[PDB]
Design a protein around this ligand. Structure first.
Ligand SMILES: [Zn+2]
Ligand SMILES: [Zn+2]
Length: 69
């Protein structure tokens, strides 16, 4: 008897969506923003449309457009 101990640990404190505060996986739907963070594509859509900046970093992310949003 258990149960368990631990934790599937294992790794990633490296590429987690800061918006979901959750891990990503290798080849998942992701995005890169100019202040060098890597988020889910879905989460960061909603991030951008809410306000175009890396949320922690404050730097804008509307990369060289030229349009609206
Ligand atoms: Zn996410
Ligand atoms: Zn950033």
């Amino acid at each position: 008897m258990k149960q368990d101990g631990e934790e599937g640990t294992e790794e990633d404190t490296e590429e987690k969506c800061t918006i979901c505060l959750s891990i990503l996986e290798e080849g998942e739907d992701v995005r890169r923003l100019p202040c060098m963070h890597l988020f889910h594509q879905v989460c960061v859509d909603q991030a951008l449309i809410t306000n175009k900046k890396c949320p922690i970093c404050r730097v804008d992310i509307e990369a060289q457009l030229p349009s609206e949003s």
